[PDB]
Amino acid sequence: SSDPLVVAASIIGILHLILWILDRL
Amino acid sequence: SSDPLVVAASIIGILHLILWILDRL
Amino acid sequence: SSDPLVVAASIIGILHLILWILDRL
């Protein structure tokens, strides 16, 4: 388990990557 | 809970994203 | 130990960096 802050940051980070890929495609 | 180093890095990461968005807007 | 979500995000983050470096080189 992790700090809820870290879990939040991890989710935001992944979604940021996915949005960037979809934008490029 | 997480390592204080990881908590620190998560905070820096989020603030980096927010500053980038505000700069673009 | 960390949340499996955070572990996943950390792996994705590193691989993203490695791919970017290899692309530049």
Next chain:
Amino acid sequence: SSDPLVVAASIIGILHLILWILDRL
């Protein structure tokens, strides 16, 4: 505490930011 993998990724992430800032400056 966090997974050693996550600790590693956090350190790499911060150093990446610092190097980028120093490069820009």
